[PDB]
Amino acid sequence: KVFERCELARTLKRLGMDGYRGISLANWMCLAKWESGYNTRATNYNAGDRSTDYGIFQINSRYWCNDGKTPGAVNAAHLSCSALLQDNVADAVAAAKRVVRDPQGIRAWVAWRNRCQNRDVRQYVQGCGV
**Which residues are CB-neighbours of 7 under 8 A, at least 6 positions away?**
none
Say which of 53, 67, 87, 120 is annotated catalytic.
53
Say which of 4, 7, 18, 35 is annotated catalytic.
35
Q: Is 53 a catalytic residue?
A: yes
Cα–Cα distance, 127 to 74 (Å, whole number): 40
**Paired residues of 24 in beta bridges:** none
Other beta carbons less than 10 A from residue 57's beta carbon: 23
**Which residues are CB-neighbours of 21 under 8 A, at least 6 positions away?**
97, 100, 101, 105
Q: Is 7 a catalytic residue?
A: no
**Residues designated catalytic:** 35, 53
